[PDB]
Design a protein around this nucleic acid. Structure first.
Ligand SMILES: Nc1ncnc2c1ncn2[C@@H]1O[C@H](COP(=O)(O)OP(=O)(O)O)[C@@H](O)[C@H]1O
Ligand code: NA
Length: 564
DNA sequence: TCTCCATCGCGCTAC
DNA sequence: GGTAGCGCGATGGAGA
């Protein structure tokens, strides 16, 4: 039940003090919804880190993608080195890798019950279904030295919380027994296992151990062993659960036969039986999450348990890039219901599998205690519910928001080519946005023809190779990058002095108030930052973006002359 | 009611 | 009875 200790070589600067203080004040006044309107490049992760430290609550931060999530996580481990900073997302291949991520998920949920100083960076996997956090906590095996317990009953418990007996391939989520030593590999650890040495019905010693080399690392007075699955139930309840699944199965197979669908019924039966055979062995299976209703014995159509429930009631939520993350959350349920419904109709799953689902937005709302939305361009939900906004526009470095010229489309490419050439001579980079992948590739060709070092960047390119291209631009291998909608949230490249927005009047999600400001922001990390919008008209979106950027530059200039 | 891009999750379908 | 690699719905925001 510890305390956050913020570790930074610097202290709040710019308008971070007023931002940190207004947020902390609102949290202490019990304000449910708050918005931090923080321009790109102002120290937002540091700002938030200060708020978290001053209210000292377990906090959940939700990001809309994992590149950002991973960045936030690495940064928050830096700022809070002696605190529990965790990561709760699911599988991806840009940071085995699959087991590393399952390990962190268990490390996240266990940390919530062990200590108070916890920060969990998460994707929308945070609103997907888990098993009861009550069952998970009460099934924890709490081991103390000189404790009256039978080696007998310890092993009974471990199996029921999903550790596999395995004397040979001793990996995480397993345990092995040699004579009087039961050795355990917690699901939250990748390197350290637990040695538990018995003498009759008494534990004589407990040792933290490097599982690979056997190097004893030290002693332990006590140790808590959490379950190796988030969908754990008591063996007591499995007997009735398997009955209720069997009953659900026959009813469903009758539905299928009464509509023909013999191929679907055979498919369903084969699969359910296999899962049932496994449930009478241990308790788990391949797709165990789909039997959550029956396993937890809960009323049908119940609200699922999520990561939010594993948090204490007085927790804080930070929504990063809220203008994008909130719409992501909102549409998850209907999409899920639809994909699951096709599986039930084709005999891949029982209808009870619909209860294994993500929260609705309404359900999510009710699980919120206190929340802070963080966006340079917050959406209508955030503004509607928050009492005004906490504006953070003075960057700590004093870097200004860029200037924005509007130029005609006629002769635009040749204008841009000329403009790029100037930047090459000043050892500066350029970013261009177009409307499609095709146009991006076509333009990249045309620039290569004109003696410009150029490469494209869009969703067809895999994440690993994107890192390379972003590095190459920085190193000066490329001078220009042409994209569509990846020159956005979280692309921090200070070598870029020019952003060129082609088809700036082609209104829609690619050219809205929100996306324009976000794109403009890529030129705010440079002291000569400049933006050019090629267009024959100034759309309502362009108007607002130019207007807001002009206000920020003027205000920032006003600050810089005052403070040297 | 479709398009443009880019993201998440899940889970079938081939290695 | 092991897993990476696709395909799927929803979302922003307008045009058509
Ligand atoms: N209060 C501060 N004093 C000095 N430097 C800071 C402060 N806050 C942030 N920084 C640094 O300034 C740089 C730019 O800020 P950054 O945190 O990237 O802004 P954002 O994350 O909002 O885009 C970062 O490398 C960060 O380490
Ligand atoms: Na909209």
């Amino acid at each position: 039940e510890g305390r956050f200790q913020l570790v930074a070589p610097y202290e709040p600067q710019g308008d971070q003090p007023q931002a940190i203080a207004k947020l902390v004040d609102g949290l202490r006044r019990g304000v449910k919804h708050q918005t931090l309107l923080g321009a790109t490049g102002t120290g937002k992760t540091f700002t938030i880190s200060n708020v978290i430290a001053q209210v000292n609550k377990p906090t959940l931060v939700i990001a809309h993608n994992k590149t950002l999530a991973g960045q936030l996580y690495s940064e928050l481990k830096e700022f809070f080195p002696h605190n529990a900073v965790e990561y709760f997302v699911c599988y991806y291949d840009y940071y085995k890798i699959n087991d590393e991520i399952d390990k962190l998920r268990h490390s996240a949920t266990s940390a919530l019950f062990e200590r108070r100083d916890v920060i969990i960076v998460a994707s929308v996997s945070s609103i997907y279904g888990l098993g009861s956090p009550e069952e998970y906590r009460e099934l924890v095996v709490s081991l103390r030295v000189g404790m009256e317990i039978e080696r007998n009953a310890l092993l009974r418990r471990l199996v029921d919380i999903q550790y596999d007996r395995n004397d040979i391939d001793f990996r995480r989520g397993t345990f092995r027994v040699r004579g009087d030593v039961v050795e355990i590999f917690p699901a939250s650890r990748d390197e350290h296992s637990i040695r538990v040495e018995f003498f009759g019905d008494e534990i004589e010693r407990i040792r933290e151990v490097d599982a690979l080399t056997g190097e004893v690392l030290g002693e332990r007075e006590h140790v808590a062993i959490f379950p190796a699955s988030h969908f754990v139930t008591r063996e007591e309840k499995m007997r009735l659960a398997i009955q209720n699944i069997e009953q659900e199965l026959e009813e469903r197979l009758a539905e299928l036969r009464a509509q023909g669908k013999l191929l679907e019924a055979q498919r369903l039966e084969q699969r359910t039986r296999y899962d049932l055979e496994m449930m009478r062995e241990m308790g788990f299976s391949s797709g165990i999450e789909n039997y959550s209703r029956h396993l937890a014995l809960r009323p049908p159509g119940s609200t699922p348990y999520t990561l939010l429930d594993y948090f204490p009631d007085d927790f804080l939520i930070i929504v990063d890039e809220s203008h994008v993350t909130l719409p992501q959350l909102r549409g998850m349920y209907n999409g899920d219901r639809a994909r699951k419904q096709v599986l039930v109709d084709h005999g891949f799953r029982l209808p009870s599998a619909l209860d294994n689902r993500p929260l609705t937005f309404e359900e999510f709302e009710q699980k919120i205690n206190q929340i802070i939305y963080v966006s340079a361009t917050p959406g209508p939900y955030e503004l509607e519910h928050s009492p005004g906004v906490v504006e953070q526009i003075i960057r700590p470095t004093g870097l200004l928001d860029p200037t924005i010229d509007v130029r005609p489309t006629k002769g635009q490419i040749d204008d841009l080519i000329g403009e790029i050439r100037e930047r090459v001579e000043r050892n500066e980079r350029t970013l261009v946005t177009t409307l499609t992948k095709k146009m991006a590739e076509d333009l990249t060709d045309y620039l290569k023809e004109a003696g410009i070092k150029v490469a494209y960047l869009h969703s067809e390119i895999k994440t690993l190779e994107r890192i390379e291209i972003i590095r190459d631009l920085r190193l000066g291998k490329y001078d220009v990058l042409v994209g569509i909608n990846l020159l956005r949230e979280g692309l921090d490249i200070p070598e870029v002095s020019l952003v060129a927005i082609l088809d700036a009047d082609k209104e829609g999600f690619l050219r809205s108030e929100r996306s324009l400001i976000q794109t403009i922001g890529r030129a705010a990390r440079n002291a000569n930052g400049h933006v050019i919008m090629y267009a024959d008209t100034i759309t309502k979106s362009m108007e607002i973006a130019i207007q807001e950027t002009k206000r920020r530059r003027a205000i920032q200039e006003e600050y810089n002359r005052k403070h040297g």
